[PDB]
Amino acid sequence: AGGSTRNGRDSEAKRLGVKRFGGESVLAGSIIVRQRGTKFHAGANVGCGRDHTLFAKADGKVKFEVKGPKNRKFISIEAE
Amino acid sequence: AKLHDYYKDEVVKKLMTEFNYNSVMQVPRVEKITLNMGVGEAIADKKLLDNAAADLAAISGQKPLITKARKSVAGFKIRQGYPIGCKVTLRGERMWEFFERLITIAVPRIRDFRGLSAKSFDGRGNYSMGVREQIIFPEIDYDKVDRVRGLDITITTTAKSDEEGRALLAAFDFPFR
Amino acid sequence: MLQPKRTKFRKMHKGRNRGLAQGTDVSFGSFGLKAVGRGRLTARQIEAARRAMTRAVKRQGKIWIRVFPDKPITEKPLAVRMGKGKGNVEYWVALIQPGKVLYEMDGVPEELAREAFKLAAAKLPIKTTFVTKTVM
C-alpha cells in the first residue's frame, strides 16, 4: 500500500459555441455566439455583451463574414 | 540665437561647400540638447535629487523633469516608479545660448582641459559628452554647494552620418582635440 | 544514451504509430539505413547500433543519426495495482514508421557500409534495408 495523486481537478463545461448558425432567422435579443474573447466581432445590428457575447439587436438572419485588414470575423444581421 | 545666426549665414555655406549637397535642406542642423543627471543615490534622500535639480535649473533656465525608473532592478535597490534622475531638453534660442556659454565659458573652466573626443558621435551624428563637475558653470556658486554632482550632455542633431556632425561642430569651433 | 535535456511535460500519452514516414530520402550522407517495418525504438538500441557501426568503420567516414528518442515510456512497478496514477517515466523511445531513414553514412565504401549497417540492424527490433543517395 502506498501512493497518492495531484491531478484530480477540472472545471465545469461552460457550453460556449455558436448558438445560431448562418441563414438562421433570429429574434431581437437572441444570443448568437457565446465566447471568451472576441474570436468573432460584432457587425451590423449586433451587440457585444459584457463577456464578449454576441447578441442580436434586431430581428433577421445571421450573416457571418470576414472583413477588415486583419481578416477578422464579423457577424451581421440581415433584415427580415 | 547668436550662433543660430552664425549657422544660418556662415555654417550653411561652409557645409554646402564641404559636402556638395544638392539642397540646403539636405544640410545638417542641431535640433536639441539633453542634460541628464542620473542621481541613483536619491533613494537615500529626495533632497539630493531635489537640490541637484535646483543646481541644474540655474545652468539652463528651465525646471528639470525628474525622471523615474523604467523598470525595477534589485542591484540598484529600485522599483518601477522611484525618482532616480533629472533631465532637461533644450531647444531653440535657449539651446543656442547654452551652447555659446558652453564652448565659450564652461569648457575653459574644465580642470585640465586638453580637448574632447571625436569618437563620441553614436554612429549617427548625435554627440554626447559628460562633465565631471558642475562648478565649471559660473551659474553654480562654489561656497553654496557641498557635494560635487555630475551630469552628461547629449547633442541631438539632424546629421545622418558621424562626420556631418563632426564638421558641423567644427563649424562651431567645437574643441575636439 | 540520447534523452531530451528539457521537456515541457514529464509524461505523454501512449498514442498510436500509424501512417507513413517522412524522412525517406538520404539527405546528408551517401548511404542510409531505412526502416521497413513499424514500431518504436529506444536510446539503447540506437546507441548500440551506433557503436556497432562506428567500430565496423574504424571511425572512418561520417555518421548521421536521423532519429531522436523523445517519447517517454512509463511502466508500473511490480505488485502495484492498476490504479493510483500514471507510472513513472523509465525510458525514451522514438516512433518509427516505414520509410524512415534511421542512420546515414559516408566517407566509406559501399561494402563497408553494408556490413556496418548489417551489424547495426542486428541490434534493432525492426526490419531494415540499405539505401543510397538518389539523384532527385
Next chain:
Amino acid sequence: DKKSARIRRATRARRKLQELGATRLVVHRTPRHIYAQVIAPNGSEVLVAASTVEKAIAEQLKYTGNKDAAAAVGKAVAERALEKGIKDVSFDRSGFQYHGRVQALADAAREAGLQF
C-alpha cells in the same frame, strides 16, 4: 508618422459613426487650407463639399488657413447642405483637436443651421 497617428486618433469615432449609420461631416485641416465634406452613411460617397481651395471662397479671404476661413467654410458647407436638404449630421474632427479652426468651423455650421 504624424499622418498615421492622426488616423489612429480618428479611426475609433469613424467606426463608431459607421455603425451608427450617421451622415457624417468630415473636417480636414492643413496649415494653408481647410476642407469639409458631408459623407453618406455608406462612407463611400459625398453629398456636399467645401474648402478654402475653391475660388469662390478663397477670393473673399485674407489667408485660407485661419479661423475666418474656417468659419467661411463651415458657413458655405452648411448652406449647401441645407440647400440639398441635409440638416442633421455628426461631426468628425478626423484626429484633430476640437479647437481653433475646427471649433470655429463647427460653430459656424451650428450657427448656419446644422445639428450636431
Next chain:
Amino acid sequence: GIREKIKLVSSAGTGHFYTTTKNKRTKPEKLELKKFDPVVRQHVIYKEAKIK
C-alpha cells in the same frame, strides 16, 4: 477577508442605505458618494456609516 463592509446612509433624512466594502487599513478617511435616492428621486450625498 480584511476588506470590511459598511453602509452609505442617505443625507436626505431618509433611512435609505447602500451597502459596500472598504479596506479600513489603507483608507482611513470616510467615504462620501453622491448616489441616487429612490425615495426622493434625487441624487443625494450618501455618507459612510457602520454596518451594525
Next chain:
Amino acid sequence: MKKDIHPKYEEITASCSCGNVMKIRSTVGHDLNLDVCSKCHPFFTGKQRDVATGGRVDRFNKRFNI
C-alpha cells in the same frame, strides 16, 4: 514655456582677462568677471607646448663634453 516654474533668465555681461566682453542670458543676475575664455584659453598654444617629452640622449650630451 510655462510661466512661474522657471527661474529668471536675464541678459548679463561676462568680461574676461583678455577683455572678451560677452553678453549672455543667464540665471546669475549680476555681471560676471571671468579668468579664461575660449579666446584666451591656452588650447591653441599651451596645449601644443604641454607635451614636452625631452630627449635622454640630449640630456646626456647636454650635461658635459667629452
Next chain:
RNA sequence: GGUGAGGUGUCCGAGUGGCUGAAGGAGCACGCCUGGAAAGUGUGUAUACGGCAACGUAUCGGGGGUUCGUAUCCCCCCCUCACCGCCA
C-alpha cells in the same frame, strides 16, 4: 512502498523575499602574562577569484527554477529523524 520534518562558513547555533556573503558563542590565528606551557586578557576571523584587487562571481544538502530580487519561495535528486508497511 507510502506520510509527515528537515538538510547553514571548523563546530554549535540564529534565522520562514529586501547589508542574512550570514548573528552570537566555542573553536582557529595574533598578541600579552608564565621560568615555560594551560587556564588567562585583549585583538582578528569563509572559500576561488581577477580587473588593481575598489567590488561583482559564486555557493543554506546537490540541480533546477520565479518574483526586480531568495539563505527563506517552489520544484526534482538524494540523506537523515518520527508514523504507518494490518486482516486473512
Next chain:
RNA sequence: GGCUCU
C-alpha cells in the same frame, strides 16, 4: 577568597 603541570 581560587588557581594546575613542568
Next chain:
RNA sequence: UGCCUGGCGGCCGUAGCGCGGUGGUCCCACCUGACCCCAUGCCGAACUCAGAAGUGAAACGCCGUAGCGCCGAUGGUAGUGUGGGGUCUCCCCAUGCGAGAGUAGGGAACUGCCAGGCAU
C-alpha cells in the same frame, strides 16, 4: 476627356516590403515666428495659433525593378463516410469526398464618390 494631387471609402498582401529613379504651377510636406487661442508632469519637440521666405533633403506620392513576401494550378500522395476483406498494435478492396506541403506558373494591385490644379 486626359494628366496630376488631396479627402473619404470598397477590398485586405497578385494589394506588403526591398532596391533604384523621379516630382514642386497647384496640392501636400518640411518650413518662419509666437505677445496672443492653447500647450509642455522641462522644452512652440508634440499640440495649437498667426503666417508663406525657402526647399523638395526627409516624409509622401509616382515610375521602374523579381532580392523577398504573397498567390498558386494539374496530377499524385496522406486522410476519410459506407460496404466488404486480411497475415488484424496495422493495412487492403469497391465506391464517394479529397487535403496539406511541394512544382509549373502568376505577380511590382484593382476600383468608386467629391473637390482642386494644368492641358484640352
Next chain:
RNA sequence: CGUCGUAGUCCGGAUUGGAGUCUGCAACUCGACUCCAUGAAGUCGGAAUCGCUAGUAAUCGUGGAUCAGAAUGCCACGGUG
C-alpha cells in the same frame, strides 16, 4: 615682536618624481647631504608593560670614538629643571 587660531591645519613629515653636491677606481643592486615639488599614516594609543627619589626624571643642544665616506646607535659634555 609679529604671525597662524583648532582644522589632519602654515601640525606632521613619510613616500615618490626631477635637478644637484661630496667621498671614493667606483654610490645600479647599495651611501650621505642639498634644492624644487610631492604632502601618507597619525588627532595621545587595547590587554599589557618600563624607568626614575634631586640637579634626579623630563626636555635642550654640543663633542668624540669607529671612519675615505657612511648614525635616530654608543660613550662623554653642559643648559633649563
Next chain:
RNA sequence: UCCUCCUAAAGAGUAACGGAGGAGCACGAAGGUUGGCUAAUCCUGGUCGGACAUCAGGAGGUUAGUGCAAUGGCAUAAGCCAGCUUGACUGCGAGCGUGACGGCGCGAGCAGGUGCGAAAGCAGGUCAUAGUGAUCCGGUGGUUCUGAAUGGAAGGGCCAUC
C-alpha cells in the same frame, strides 16, 4: 466546492485514485468618461555608473503588457498617462442561453434622476471566464400593510440588510 487546458473522437456535452496548474480575493480607484500615448529586447555613445538605474539615436515591431493561474482575446487598443467625476444609479425589461430542479447568465430598449464630452454618444462596476453557502432561527433600520372586544401596543408581514 469553484476556475483554466488536454484527454474530448473539427457543434454542445462527455469518465477514470488520468496528465498539468490555480481560487476561497483585491480596487472608493486598479471603476466611468473625455483627451492623448504605444511596448519587450538588443546596438552605439555617454560623469559618478558598475551585468544591470537615468539620457540621446538606431535596430526591432508586441517576442511586452493584462491586479492574480491558464486559455481565448486585446492597436479603434481591453495596455499606458492626465482632467473631470460616481452609471460600483433605482424601478423594469422584449428576447434568448444554460441547467432534472433549486437556480445561474446575457440583454437592446423604457421611465426617473445623474456624470463626462462641444456633440454624436458612452456609463446599470473592473478584458472575460474562479474569489463562494440554500432554508430555518434570530438581530438592525424603514414601512400603519396586519393589530384576537375597541383604541393603541407587543408580535408578525413587506423592503433593505447582517
Next chain:
RNA sequence: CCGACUUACCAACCCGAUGCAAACUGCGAAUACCGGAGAAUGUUAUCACGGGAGACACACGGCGGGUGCUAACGUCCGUC
C-alpha cells in the same frame, strides 16, 4: 598594464538542410451538427398535457481513444 600570437578547444546569434508534439499551429479535410427550400415514402412515425410505471449492478464485439505491457473474457469514456 598592454597584450603576442595560435587553436580552433567549445560556441552565441544568424543562415541553409532535416526530424518530433495530447496540453505547438502562418494550413486544414471527411464525417457529424444547426438552419432553409424541395419531391417520394412511412398506420403521426413529431410535440404538448394528463394517468400508470419500471429502471439508474450491464455485457461482448467494431471503430476513435485514456490507463495498463497498444497484456487480460482488464478498466474508464464517445459512437454503433
